[model samples]
Target: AAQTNAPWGLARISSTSPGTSTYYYDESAGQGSCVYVIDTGIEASHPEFEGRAQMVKTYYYSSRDGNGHGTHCAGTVGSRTYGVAKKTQLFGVKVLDDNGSGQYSTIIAGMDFVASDKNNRNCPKGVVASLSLGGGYSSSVNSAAARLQSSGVMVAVAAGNNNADARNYSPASEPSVCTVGASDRYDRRSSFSNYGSVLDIFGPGTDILSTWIGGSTRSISGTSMATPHVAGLAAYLMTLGKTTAASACRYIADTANKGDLSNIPFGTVNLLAYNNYQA
Candidate 1:
């Protein structure tokens, strides 16, 4: 995908790569903050990562992502070429397999890795765990999200794409995590994105362009694509003097826009706002 033809999602969020005078891009860029991308494993060797991605933990199908979903999400979160927080110290906790099938137990296991990873806990700033995979009802995964939030890590997860009420699912319905859904440049909530009381905010998700598994770029559409936006923002916020997930949520609530969206469910109003850097 050419930069001229990049998805409106990246353009709306201002994730353009370096050397460009883009007004809308992220200014809180990166602080080498640790971000655990919990999904399919990432292509650690992707040039966008510049060799900073760590896939040390995997529940199945090894640590490499044969599927492009994980790699794309990682890029959106921290790729210097196409990310909000371009300098993130990225990691992967692979819960899903090559076929994109993951068990509830496997999902919980990935959460456990980010929850207690010594490297994550030892970081000066808090850690961010991004989960672009979630659906159905799973108390086990939801509980871990709460525990991890209390344990000093900021977690973000996708509001499922079922176009149904999100409360009926896991992770998104989980309290204490930034539950993100998808939106478009037209200020409309996505038709496939779950709405209503469960979502915390919306991010651009349609036709999201990001790094693929084999050193290429492709566009993907889903709440999965939107999840990384909040995750990247949380990671950058940690470097800007916010240490806890709760504090990050507070900033998000105060900073996100409310009037930028249409077609949201009744009383479901939360839109992402751009971060500013005036210092």
Candidate 2:
């Protein structure tokens, strides 16, 4: 029952995208990789997440999820139904509160807490940070991300939903982060997605269906919705035996479909996250 079937993204990756998804990685569901979602907390008891998620840390906020946005992002990252890595140990880092707001300073605490717990997870495979939130100031998150990357953790961040250049966003603009934008099922940029040279790739963001709060499910859109697609990809790549943040980034960039992108600001930059994995 590990892989009774393939989700659309995984199905698409295995069939139409370049070389084909990894043979056992997806089936293994990122067995060795651990993903930490730093956002508005998650409903750890949500049925879709059952044994898959835990609250690893809380930064100036409660451990419970009142808003459910974080749970939705976590669902896409590792839920049994809408996941990219169904077997990865999903951890929650509550950086934002019920109002979807948090001080930029607390993001640093969240990053370190994830890294601290990463060592305790006891797996040699890579650990990943999936962030669906963003801000303008980078003085703190930038420094923390660099440290996390140095410690061998892959950081994936949303490129933002403002439909502008993502260069202004903190983690998205950071060179050490994997910046993700939103694309629709038809491979077109979502109407409100941010785009530009800073974008690392585009993913299924428009109307993405995934785990929600209250033991239910729903579909939503935003670059926030898109980043998890690649965050899971990073973990899946890790299950290919042995890999790192740099190697996973290379695998994603090299195997993705650049020619399929429907919108780019002419000469700004060329990008794609066809998101197929190579073994």
Candidate 3:
């Protein structure tokens, strides 16, 4: 039975391939959980968000998203129509600019805010920071990611779309973060996704449909899209009291569909993200 107007990624994660073509999730999947999108920015007015999304911080002049990258990512994380955690609260931390680029300092600054907010008791019961961007190895960004994780926020990051070793990227290479790779509908690793032992799990990324700028939607592909699927799953786990970053990572890794992906890089874990929902 079709439970909702689910996305292919959503259906794929809830079960193995040849699923019921529906998204089956707990009603309280992400209740009282918070997911911070650390990216370009978000369009909070989109109906897909259902008033659960808001712009909380920005490093630049405005909180508006000229580029649709962040908005699309936000949709995959918590949008009512396309998200994995439909009830999770979304907070946008604008680090990247309209062109989907930002300095290390800007990204660090956004992480800093989220960390401080958690310490200040501003976060909900569970918190997750989703990073869908990556760059060359940088100690600064990696340290920031570690610090954020230390501050009690589960961090999920992209393994990059360069098709190289994810160990060469900043936060993706960080041992403290849950780095995600991309897969397609056919349960195959995305050809352009970075891999290696650093990747924690794979999520559907190719031709994913989600919310976009100006209250519209678009289909796109990247490890960037895959990262949020893990982020949303992390948020869902938090609702079940997987409050610590290590616990969240362990639960996701242990519960994933094992040895199911094809063309995964030599050292990459052949596990795909699963929501543990059986209907």
Candidate 4:
């Protein structure tokens, strides 16, 4: 598994020729921290997730394990030892049920729960939130996300997997949110990843190995998977003194491999540039 701060290294190793031996060592010392995985509940018993994930809270707004999108996303964000931020805490919010759909109100309610200091007393302070689901952009959702940002909570969303020029939906296109796009194992923009001026960063999405329900393994694809990689990386960067969404984003953008892709527009952000600005 790729350790925190090792995505580029992993990309480099995976892109190497098949017959070559490429050995690398984990550099960043492990830091036990917390981040919210606002999606489906994770399989807590998976070995890869053992001792790595902490279930701070669970919100079952819909039936459990319906389409497994949340579970898969949880695995990607913080499935114990399997994910990049294995030591980070995960909070599962079941906004979408078995039908693989959810209402905007339900989704907003979930965000409220995560961002509510009075409600989530047990959750850590200054914790980052990851949202793997999105729909058409909305002014209401943007306002809500901005509020969350003002409260000292960072929110990260997927920049949809539709391969479109414009951003897909509500929270992703929202100004205050960190919108993440998809990149292949080779660090190239994914064909299906949506790109636009709203895109804040890119991460691994293709052929991603993550946890599913029933202790099973699955290879899922989408900007959903890519979002968590950045979420976890952001959490990891925070440990390295890269606090706040903008600062963490700058670190990633400065380090990511930049290039052109067919579906991505020219001058679109390939990675978020890490500026030393403190907010």
Candidate 5:
């Protein structure tokens, strides 16, 4: 199912002034690219994701999904109808179980799986890893992400949904990873989004419409949802010759939309600016 909200309308004016709604037609659609979603297992049977996901390389480190966060996140990133990168291929890495929790070791193991995929042809090439899970500050997580980043794999992570400082997490706070924050429909930061110097970009979070498990659909909110928007945008940028992580990030940052919301804390992002660069 698609969104029932107004196709295009002024949701709200920013605190600074009138806000504008940016329209992206998804011309690239990630037709020949692949992205690795390092989260929980996805509901592969969903029609919105059919013929869109490449699950040959899957790691169900966790037994199953408990709260459907991973599945929902996956849909936003690559679900055929509701995804930002609808034509992009997805690789599932189920590190968290049904209860929405996983051990640090298991998470590390999942990262290793992605880092070592160059040796396995079954896995996608030039894979960009998107992670929506994080543990409190840990050098171990930082080290793992660095290893992946050094291996030509770009990593994007969630800035957490705590609405607090992002110094709390490892990968998100790590220098090599692109940390994502959440913004509402009006292009303002969501109250629940964690902020800090670590935040690299922001994307839609409030009431985001996407596919769900059991072939369903719904609107969910979180930095997790926001992470994929940047990830997909990065993938699209890559197609336009912005291949490196730094280049992709620079393009997005330089082009992000500046909203009317004043008093936005440090590290706030603008999606409109990012889209303008693509024009």
Candidate 6:
């Protein structure tokens, strides 16, 4: 296999070693699957989306992505150029405002909407949601995420950027959701990534490049960035018939590049996400 010149994060996830600059993936892995980006919003018109991204659900925020966080996370999940699951349908569920701020009520509303939408459509391929926002523990938010998972939507969440224990965060601490921490290009835990027993996996999050507003790209850091990589991975697995949220989580952990990260926190799992692409 030749180097695909993909982003380092994408290339990082598809291999077992730390030094490769190639990305290998099944082009059709997410063909019929769907992913919901619950964040600031998305630039549906961004070229990286190839017209596949849409703003389907919005709370108090505008329909467009005034801030690039949502679009960036969405890009990492399913954008044609930067995504891990290139063919999955991208749905923007805007909960946070342009300033990347939102109340728990709004976040819960967005989660409910996605679950209801899934039931309404009776989607067969599978559904996954990426949550790149978090705060101190909120039972309501955690319950909402758990409910979303119970409805069969595979949920992936950020382990937080606070550099503290993820167990103290809300949805990330929720056992039902797959919590992801940040890893660097050197296969080490990101300096700011929250870790501990609550984290389920890790992905490239430092100086990572992804889609931005206005049809451009940007490089940023945070567990927010890492979460979508796992979200995309879950969506790709769903396309392969790992439909249940629990099963998708299990498959991702089982197939991950195990014990490969350096500077891992004491309680953090040593798994780095892998796309299971056979080169």
Give the clash count for model 3. Answer: 0
How well is each residue in 74-193 modelled by candidate 6, as lDDT tens digits? 999988778888888889989999999999999999999999987654346788999999999999999999999998899999999998998899899999889999999999899999
True-structure RMSD for candidate 4: 4.9
lDDT of 2 by residue, 1-279 (tens): 233344444444443442333322446778878889999898989888868799978865379888889999999888977788788889899999988888887878888777787888855567888989888848577778767777778888898988888888787788777888887766678889888787777777888778888899888889998888888888877876545876666567777776676776764345555434344
lDDT of 3 at 236: 87
The residue pairs found clashing in candidate 1 are none
**TM-score for each predicted model, relative to the true structure:** 0.90, 0.90, 0.96, 0.80, 0.84, 0.96
List ranges where model 3 is wrong by over 4 Å: 18-20, 119-123
TM-score between candidate 4 and the true structure: 0.80
Q: lDDT per residue, candidate 5, 1-279, as tens digits?
A: 122231121112111222443334346666566677777777776787886664434345433444567678778777765666666777777877767777888788888888887446432324577898887999998889878777766688898988888887878888777888887766567888888887777776767777676678878888888887777666655655556554666667665555544346755544332433322
Each candidate's lDDT (Cα)?
0.77, 0.77, 0.88, 0.63, 0.67, 0.88
Could you tell me which 10 consecutive residues in candidate 5 have the lowest summed lDDT?
6-15
TM-score, structure 3 vs. true: 0.96
lDDT of 1 by residue, 1-279 (tens): 123443466556543221233425335465657788988889989888988788869977489998989999999888976776777788888899888889988888878778788353344656888899886878887998888777777888899999998898888899778888898657678789988777888887877778998899998889999889878877777777654556786677576666667788787755664454322
Clashes of 5: 14
Cα error of candidate 3 at position 124, Å: 4.0
- Candidate 2 residues lying further than 4 Å off, grouped into runs, are 1-25, 274-279
